[PDB]
């Protein structure tokens, strides 16, 4: 619902190329705020985020020591998966491990996920209750089995429910101007003219967080079927995010066209014509 | 599933050895935990896999290595009384789970194999006023002059080990609280009716297994050397 | 064994004006495997000084990255971006257009 | 300590509940273990826990408290075999130091003796050595037995056996002295 | 903070 806090980790074997990429990033809703890339020396779990500047060094030491455990499991996991499903020793692949907590309006614990994927396709999954996981496969009941028998939904469990809600409240304190306060749009109708009798007319939404965004074109206030093409919501490598929506409309019919917005930032929703 | 040797051992002050850990549950995890008496563990090193190892909070005096994810060997450099202790051995799946323990190895370091001595057993026949007033015997068992404390006392009646009715001490005794290499006494009770001791032909032995010193180990001395070895002691029922 | 191509948009992160100094973004995201090249053109000419975001990843699995630079546009330069994946046989090379 | 527990030595009637207490000192704890040993053997896992609450099996039930940083373990229905040391362990995640072991509690199941009689015996030697021990037998759990002041003169802790076939409990404690000034009449004070 | 907590598959 309201917050959360996920990470995201991929770990990529190279066989004969030394020991797997192995990278790990940290969101708090829709802003990065940590990352792990053992592409180095001695990789370091850093900041990513400005409010994340001011931890002492028994952050990043835990952060380093718990990054580095994982890559090691991750590597011990790929060459078990090679086995289940017998793969020669030549070949890359993609070990993937999404996790996260997410809090209610009342900033207690609602929900809890963790979702493992193997060259892409999930793999093993802790269900709703975080007491059990559902396999896909014949490879996935070994590693299902194995879990039960590790007690590790226990495990899981205690991190989602407990840890990863304490962490989350600190980091919502931390970044509380980033993440608790809001950017709305900044919005604007351009025009561009395709021929003698046909315009488009393409609707801005720039510099909003979160990424969450609607974007609608309406023809004297009610849904048409024009051409209506609509870009996948970007970032702007700020911390922001961007989108487009844009209509063809017949030359001279401009301003019986508006563009809707909404977006969480808002009062209210936002309502925009072509200013010439 | 964790295999740990030895279970005894006796050094000199200054010898080295390798303490054996291996596990087959292929974790990457492995520790090496001491325990002083009647006190909690406190870690000595360990590994979160194999080619890695980190110090605990009492590394000194040890060393340990990593070639290989199954074995995790500990090696006392130059042996001390202080490291008198008991030596456990751990997997773990997670850094932070469950620690699944080896059987143990207890140490001691002597000043001199020549302090070293096997136990003289002895047992002692019920009192007739116990048989009088309590239609029960007690016999004692009683083990004196070992050392070091590294013995396992049993009880066998008609050749079969017992358990029932039987009681050893706790800790042992010093013989010399003084002295730093004191020898230690150990007793033992085992308790049968009146009736089972009043016959003759019932069988009675304390058997008191003792861990001293390895083919391999150098004696230099008159007696006989204080090698590992059982010592018993008997006797049989009696109608009056 | 999933594969999917990268899907690409190149765009400034202000609107352009001549002579202002701004960004140059090329976003790739919904590909799998990770392995990926992505590079920044100025006149055909790869630009040395370009960063890129940490490897992350959708609902889907599917992965996502930005890279970026530092530029100030000029009516006569022209920029695009470079990309090549396991599932192209030949490089993707989309040019930046500042109205999109 | 990082890890507290009271080493005791605690008794608990056979029978009755024990409770165990255990306090850590770093918030950034996450897993928790209690542990027995009987005496110089290995640590055998009672009870893990790492969710606040409770946490039931069999006649054990552990108690977890984050906040408040303690875990403690209950043993319903004590039993003889559940006198051992228990140990309290913490995985602290913050150090890193794999599982933090607690200095242990001591607990001793004390049955009662039904019918006790208080009495001191004294054994010959089976060899003809003219050797005895003194045998202080059949007192009551509450019964401690004092340590020798005389360096010549030896004196047990006390044990207790059980004769399973007879239901039937008794203590004993054992004494001995190379002095032939030695009576074991008065032995035991 | 990462997860302590690390399934063996």
Same mark, same amino acid.
């Given at each position: 619902?309201?917050?959360?806090?996920?990470?995201?980790?991929?770990?990529?074997?190279?066989?004969?190329?030394?020991?797997?990429?192995?990278?790990?990033?940290?969101?708090?809703?829709?802003?990065?705020?940590?990352?792990?890339?053992?592409?180095?020396?001695?990789?370091?779990?850093?900041?990513?985020?400005?409010?994340?500047?001011?931890?002492?060094?028994?952050?990043?030491?835990?952060?380093?020591?718990?990054? $580095?455990?994982? /890559?090691?499991? *991750?590597?011990?996991?790929?060459? #078990? =998966?090679?086995?289940?499903?017998?793969?020669?020793?030549?070949?890359?692949?993609?070990?993937?491990?999404?996790?996260?907590?997410?809090?209610?309006?009342?900033?207690?614990?609602?929900?809890?996920?963790?979702?493992?994927?193997?060259?892409?396709?999930?793999?093993?999954?802790?269900?709703?209750?975080?007491?059990?996981?559902?396999?896909?496969?014949?490879?996935?009941?070994?590693?299902?089995?194995?879990?039960?028998?590790?007690?590790?939904?226990?495990?899981?469990?205690?991190?989602?429910?407990?840890?990863?809600?304490?962490?989350?409240?600190?980091?919502?304190?931390?970044?509380?101007?980033?993440?608790?306060?809001?950017?709305?749009?900044?919005?604007?109708?351009?025009?561009?003219?395709?021929?003698?009798?046909?315009?488009?007319? $393409?609707?801005? /939404?720039?510099? *909003?967080?979160?990424?969450?965004? #609607? =974007?609608?074109?309406?023809?004297?206030?009610?849904?048409?079927?024009?051409?209506?093409?609509?870009?996948?919501?970007?970032?702007?490598?700020?911390?922001?995010?961007?989108?487009?929506?844009?209509?063809?409309?017949?030359?001279?019919?401009?301003?019986?066209?508006?563009?809707?917005?909404?977006?969480?930032?808002?009062?209210?929703?936002?309502?925009?014509?072509?200013?010439? | 599933?964790?295999?740990?040797?030895?279970?005894?051992?006796?050094?000199?002050?200054?010898?080295?050895?390798?303490?054996?850990?291996?596990?087959?549950?292929?974790?990457?995890?492995?520790?090496?935990?001491?325990?002083?008496?009647?006190?909690?563990?406190?870690?000595?090193?360990?590994?979160?896999?194999?080619?890695?190892?980190?110090?605990?909070?009492?590394?000194?005096?040890?060393?340990?290595?990593?070639?290989?994810?199954?074995?995790?060997?500990?090696?006392?450099?130059?042996?001390?009384?202080?490291?008198?202790?008991?030596?456990?051995?751990?997997?773990?799946?997670?850094?932070?789970?469950?620690?699944?323990?080896?059987?143990?190895?207890?140490?001691?370091?002597?000043?001199?194999?020549?302090?070293?001595?096997?136990?003289?057993?002895?047992?002692?026949?019920?009192?007739?006023?116990?048989?009088?007033?309590?239609?029960?015997?007690?016999?004692?068992?009683?083990?004196?002059?070992?050392?070091?404390?590294?013995?396992?006392?049993?009880?066998?009646?008609?050749?079969?080990?017992?358990?029932?009715?039987?009681?050893?001490?706790?800790?042992?005794?010093?013989?010399?609280?003084?002295?730093?290499?004191?020898?230690?006494?150990?007793?033992?009770?085992?308790?049968?009716?009146?009736?089972?001791?009043?016959?003759?032909?019932?069988?009675?032995?304390?058997?008191?297994?003792?861990?001293?010193?390895?083919?391999?180990?150098?004696?230099?001395?008159?007696?006989?050397?204080?090698?590992?070895?059982?010592?018993?002691?008997?006797?049989?029922?009696?109608?009056? | 064994?999933?594969?999917?191509?990268?899907?690409?948009?190149?765009?400034?992160?202000?609107?352009?004006?001549?002579?202002?100094?701004?960004?140059?973004?090329?976003?790739?995201?919904?590909?799998?495997?990770?392995?990926?090249?992505?590079?920044?053109?100025?006149?055909?000419?790869?630009?040395?000084?370009?960063?890129?975001?940490?490897?992350?990843?959708?609902?889907?699995?599917?992965?996502?990255?930005?890279?970026?630079?530092?530029?100030?546009?000029?009516?006569?330069?022209?920029?695009?971006?470079?990309?090549?994946?396991?599932?192209?046989?030949?490089?993707?090379?989309?040019?930046?257009?500042?109205?999109? | 300590?990082?890890?507290?527990?009271?080493?005791?030595?605690?008794?608990?009637?056979?029978?009755?509940?024990?409770?165990?207490?255990?306090?850590?000192?770093?918030?950034?704890?996450?897993?928790?273990?209690?542990?027995?040993?009987?005496?110089?053997?290995?640590?055998?896992?009672?009870?893990?826990?790492?969710?606040?609450?409770?946490?039931?099996?069999?006649?054990?039930?552990?108690?977890?408290?984050?906040?408040?940083?303690?875990?403690?373990?209950?043993?319903?229905?004590?039993?003889?075999?559940?006198?051992?040391?228990?140990?309290?362990?913490?995985?602290?995640?913050?150090?890193?130091?794999?599982?933090?072991?607690?200095?242990?509690?001591?607990?001793?199941?004390?049955?009662?003796?039904?019918?006790?009689?208080?009495?001191?015996?004294?054994?010959?030697?089976?060899?003809?050595?003219?050797?005895?021990?003194?045998?202080?037998?059949?007192?009551?759990?509450?019964?401690?037995?004092?340590?020798?002041?005389?360096?010549?003169?030896?004196?047990?802790?006390?044990?207790?056996?059980?004769?399973?076939?007879?239901?039937?409990?008794?203590?004993?404690?054992?004494?001995?002295?190379?002095?032939?000034?030695?009576?074991?009449?008065?032995?035991?004070? | 903070?990462?997860?302590?907590?690390?399934?063996?598959?």
């Amino acid at each position: 619902g309201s917050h959360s806090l996920k990470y995201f980790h991929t770990s990529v074997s190279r066989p004969g190329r030394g020991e797997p990429r192995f990278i790990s990033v940290g969101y708090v809703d829709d802003t990065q705020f940590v990352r792990f890339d053992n592409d180095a020396a001695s990789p370091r779990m850093v900041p990513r985020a400005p409010w994340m500047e001011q931890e002492g060094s028994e952050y990043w030491d835990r952060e380093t020591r718990s990054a $580095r455990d994982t /890559a090691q499991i *991750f590597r011990v996991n790929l060459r #078990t =998966l090679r086995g289940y499903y017998n793969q020669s020793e030549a070949g890359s692949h993609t070990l993937q491990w999404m996790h996260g907590c997410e809090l209610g309006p009342d900033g207690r614990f609602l929900r809890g996920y963790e979702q493992f994927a193997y060259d892409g396709k999930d793999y093993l999954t802790l269900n709703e209750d975080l007491r059990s996981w559902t396999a896909v496969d014949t490879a996935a009941q070994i590693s299902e089995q194995k879990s039960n028998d590790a007690s590790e939904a226990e495990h899981q469990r205690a991190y989602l429910e407990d840890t990863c809600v304490e962490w989350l409240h600190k980091y919502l304190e931390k970044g509380k101007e980033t993440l608790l306060h809001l950017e709305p749009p900044k919005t604007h109708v351009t025009h561009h003219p395709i021929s003698d009798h046909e315009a488009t007319l $393409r609707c801005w /939404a720039l510099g *909003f967080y979160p990424a969450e965004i #609607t =974007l609608t074109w309406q023809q004297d206030g009610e849904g048409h079927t024009q051409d209506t093409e609509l870009v996948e919501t970007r970032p702007a490598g700020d911390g922001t995010f961007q989108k487009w929506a844009a209509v063809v409309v017949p030359s001279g019919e401009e301003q019986r066209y508006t563009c809707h917005v909404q977006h969480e930032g808002l009062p209210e929703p936002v309502t925009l014509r072509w200013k010439p | 599933g964790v295999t740990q040797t030895p279970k005894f051992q006796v050094l000199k002050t200054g010898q080295s050895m390798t303490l054996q850990c291996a596990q087959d549950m292929n974790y990457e995890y492995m520790s090496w935990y001491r325990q002083d008496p009647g006190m909690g563990l406190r870690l000595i090193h360990y590994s979160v896999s194999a080619g890695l190892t980190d110090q605990g909070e009492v590394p000194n005096g040890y060393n340990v290595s990593r070639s290989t994810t199954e074995d995790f060997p500990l090696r006392l450099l130059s042996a001390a009384p202080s490291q008198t202790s008991v030596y456990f051995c751990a997997s773990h799946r997670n850094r932070l789970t469950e620690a699944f323990f080896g059987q143990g190895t207890r140490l001691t370091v002597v000043e001199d194999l020549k302090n070293v001595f096997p136990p003289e057993v002895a047992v002692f026949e019920p009192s007739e006023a116990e048989i009088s007033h309590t239609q029960k015997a007690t016999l004692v068992c009683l083990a004196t002059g070992f050392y070091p404390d590294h013995v396992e006392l049993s009880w066998w009646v008609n050749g079969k080990e017992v358990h029932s009715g039987v009681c050893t001490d706790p800790q042992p005794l010093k013989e010399q609280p003084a002295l730093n290499d004191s020898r230690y006494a150990l007793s033992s009770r085992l308790r049968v009716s009146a009736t089972f001791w009043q016959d003759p032909r019932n069988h009675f032995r304390c058997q008191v297994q003792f861990y001293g010193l390895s083919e391999n180990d150098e004696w230099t001395q008159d007696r006989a050397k204080p090698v590992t070895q059982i010592v018993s002691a008997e006797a049989w029922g009696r109608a009056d | 064994m999933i594969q999917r191509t990268p899907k690409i948009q190149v765009y400034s992160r202000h609107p352009a004006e001549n002579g202002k100094s701004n960004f140059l973004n090329c976003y790739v995201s919904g590909f799998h495997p990770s392995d990926i090249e992505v590079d920044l053109l100025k006149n055909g000419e790869r630009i040395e000084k370009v960063e890129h975001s940490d490897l992350s990843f959708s609902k889907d699995w599917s992965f996502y990255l930005l890279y970026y630079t530092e530029f100030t546009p000029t009516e006569k330069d022209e920029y695009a971006c470079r990309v090549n994946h396991v599932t192209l046989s030949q490089p993707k090379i989309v040019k930046w257009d500042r109205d999109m | 300590k990082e890890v507290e527990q009271n080493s005791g030595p605690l008794s608990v009637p056979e029978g009755a509940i024990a409770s165990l207490n255990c306090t850590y000192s770093d918030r950034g704890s996450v897993s928790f273990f209690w542990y027995r040993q009987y005496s110089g053997k290995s640590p055998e896992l009672i009870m893990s826990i790492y969710l606040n609450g409770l946490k039931e099996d069999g006649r054990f039930t552990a108690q977890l408290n984050k906040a408040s940083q303690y875990v403690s373990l209950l043993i319903r229905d004590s039993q003889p075999s559940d006198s051992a040391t228990y140990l309290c362990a913490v995985g602290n995640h913050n150090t890193g130091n794999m599982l933090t072991f607690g200095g242990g509690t001591r607990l001793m199941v004390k049955p009662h003796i039904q019918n006790p009689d208080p009495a001191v015996y004294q054994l010959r030697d089976s060899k003809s050595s003219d050797k005895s021990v003194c045998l202080f037998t059949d007192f009551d759990s509450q019964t401690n037995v004092s340590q020798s002041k005389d360096s010549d003169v030896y004196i047990t802790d006390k044990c207790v056996l059980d004769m399973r076939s007879m239901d039937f409990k008794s203590n004993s404690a054992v004494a001995w002295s190379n002095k032939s000034d030695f009576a074991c009449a008065n032995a035991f004070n | 903070i990462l997860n302590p907590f690390l399934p063996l598959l």
